[model samples]
Target: MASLTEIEHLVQSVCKSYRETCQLRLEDLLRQRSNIFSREEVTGYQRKSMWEMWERCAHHLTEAIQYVVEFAKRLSGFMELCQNDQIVLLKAGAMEVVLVRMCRAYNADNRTVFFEGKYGGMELFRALGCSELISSIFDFSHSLSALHFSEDEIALYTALVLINAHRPGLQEKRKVEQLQYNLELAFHHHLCKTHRQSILAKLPPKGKLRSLCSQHVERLQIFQHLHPIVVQAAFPPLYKELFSKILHRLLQE
Candidate 1:
């Protein structure tokens, strides 16, 4: 068994590597500029246009998927899980992972969401019948931001999202549970040390975060059904064969 100190160090290393990879990929995608069609170029394409709205949203959603997939690549234990288990983890956790990564892009005070170098308010989504989803995300983002989580806190929280032992279809439940507990320990230890009492008191319990993630997942199911063009675009082939495998499982529902 790994000591708490050892686990803490390992978690830090894993999250640091994941954060670096995520940042690089995000910057590369932002530079591509293909994701963001210029406002002037998209002349007469009103915010009310469903296709235009989807086009604007697709890149960030896609970037979110890329973020999670890349982060998972850094988790050796995640890869070592059985094939079915791996798929289950991704299927169960992808949106939550996206939510964590995209937190920085959500500006609650400005009432805007930005991703892949584009920013927009909720007006367009309201016209597209997704106002409720946008509202929920904004509220969630507000609460999360209110916590004022540091990068390390966000990274640990993401690890918690990724290793959901409660998710069905795990081949090694005990091992997965153990990993979750280890990460949990690391998370609590780090937060308790760094945060002031006020912030610590303001932090939502882990169960609350889980509930928030579940809400995000439910909203995504709606998005997948109502706006699949955007959802489908979220996962571009990150790694050829593995990407195919994950894509199939993701599209299964």
Candidate 2:
């Protein structure tokens, strides 16, 4: 197998042709996936054959993600450390894990065996709905629903926060304000104020949630929750206040 750098080079070399080719390949593979199980002219052996085909599609989705991330990193001169737009890498990694689990679910015959006699692939179902769950993950980190997250997702989010905080570059101002505005729109201004504020207020007092979960006060869930700003877009203001009042306050110990 080629190294990640090699793959990146390959992607960069094909930049002009990749967009149209990727779209066509993805559509064709996904359509073939649906057909494997849909047609009626199936031999007894076809059941096993169909499972193999399903597995291939799951693997294809994973490769596409790996390709995209590697490509992005390469095109950007591989400058993505814990800092530099950590959200993108963090999310890209998270989605890859999800795709891995998706493969496991498929391997366990999750598809052929219907849930209440209705057959479907969860990953594909999400794709078909136009939700683009993969891309959404990169954009928003994740839903607070919690149930959908695996332990891996939690770890990645937490690690991303810490590594990004101490990252070298200075935070941008407009990005911070825009994040605050977007959060206000999502939860309404009141929710960001009261609900998020309450969470932050308790962080100092609640050691575990603060230490294990909120250890990076600026990156703490409470900070992220309060004002509910999107961190990448609104990095500075959110972290600055918390770092001074909460994060540094605790770190001094």
Candidate 3:
């Protein structure tokens, strides 16, 4: 059996790798700098050919889904879950994980969020029927930004997101719970070891972190249903292409 220390190292290494992989994918995908529409620009967005938007959204959707699949494979911690539990965890948390990752693209100071490279404010979200959920996300990002977690801290928190224990219907609930506890230990250890003074000062309670994930998951569930509705109404063809993917399961259900 692997020693606890070994597991901890693996956990950190895997999380760092996952974070880097996601960063690279988003950087590559967002290179084109897509635009988001304002209320005044609604007509413009409608009049414009949606092929570009469709491609951009579709590719982003693909990347997010791929990240979850590839992440599960890369992390032995995730692989340790039973098949049903793994599916449950991913089904329940993948979009939340994606949304958390998406925070990297958020510019809280400017009140703007990025979809790939496309920049928009709440006006764009409102137009897309993403107002409620996205507004909450923006708020969460604000809080997260205030804390200013380091890259390792961010990775640990993200790893916890992937293996979130609050998700329902997990087949091996105790195993999942234990894994999450181990991750928490790993997170605290890193904080205490590298930034001991900051540990007491900067650490947001785990409850807060979990709450953010839960809220994101809830918002995304609503966004999935509402987003497709609005897009299909405003831009039918693009809607079709955007959701036409193996990964569009987040919205299709």
Candidate 4:
């Protein structure tokens, strides 16, 4: 049994790890965009216009998948889970964390995501044509933004989402439950320590996140059919692997 004193040190390290590893750097964000269009000048290959526009958002979204994987590995005991369990948890929870992280870069004044170099407005993603999904994603960011989560708090909340013992197919449910409990303690301590613990009232104990995750999968299943080519050609394999596997059947009606 980890003592509160031990949990306190763990919380500090988790917070510091997030600051060092997960904080998005401007140059790195720009770099994700740079190569997507790298072939812009090339080619007898004949790039399509919609493909280029979709690629902008597509590449940026794919980059986010990798970032979420990085976040998952840093959780204590997360890697200790058997390989199968790690895959199961990441497949289920990565998008939820990505959505949470998106709130960090959301622009409230203009209602755009600060993606890649431009303000990713409705007009910017018009070519992808999944206006509804974009709107929902932006709406989530806007909604989470209203809570005014500081960076450290968001990191703590993100871990809680990923470490959820409530997720299905846990071979080591007991171990995971212990992990979740420690994270819960760490989250509570940080909130009280910062005097902003009351934000808990607005957080995921309300089931808003699960509903939101299902909604995200719902939008994506539609987008997958609506733009099969974009999904196959533009969407990253990891994004599809993490999400499309959830299936229309898995989504709530």
Q: Please tell me which predicted candidate would have the highest lDDT against the true structure.
A: 4
Over 37-125, each residue of candidate 2 has an lDDT whose tens digit, in order, gives 33332222233432343233334443444433433333222232333343333332323323222321221222321111223333333
Tens digit of per-residue lDDT, candidate 4, span 43-116: 21134365565556556666776666766777678777776677777777777887888776666765666644
| TM-score ranking, best first | 4, 1, 3, 2
Question: Across residues 7-37, which tens digit of lDDT does each residue of candidate 1 receive?
Answer: 7786677668566746434445334433443
Clashes of each: 0, 3, 0, 0
Q: lDDT per residue, candidate 3, 11-81, as tens digits?
A: 57866667755645445434433455455664454444434443345456556656666665566567766
lDDT of each: 0.62, 0.31, 0.59, 0.69
RMSD of 2: 19.3
Q: Model 4 misses residue 42 by how many Å?
A: 24
- lDDT, candidate 1, residue 167? 88
**Candidates arranged by lDDT, highest first:** 4, 1, 3, 2
Query: Which ranges in model 3 have alpha carbons more than 4 Å from their true place?
Result: 1-4, 23-62, 116-118, 196-253
Candidate 1, RMSD to the unseen true structure: 5.9
lDDT of 3: 0.59
Flag the better candidate by TM-score, 2 or 4. Answer: 4
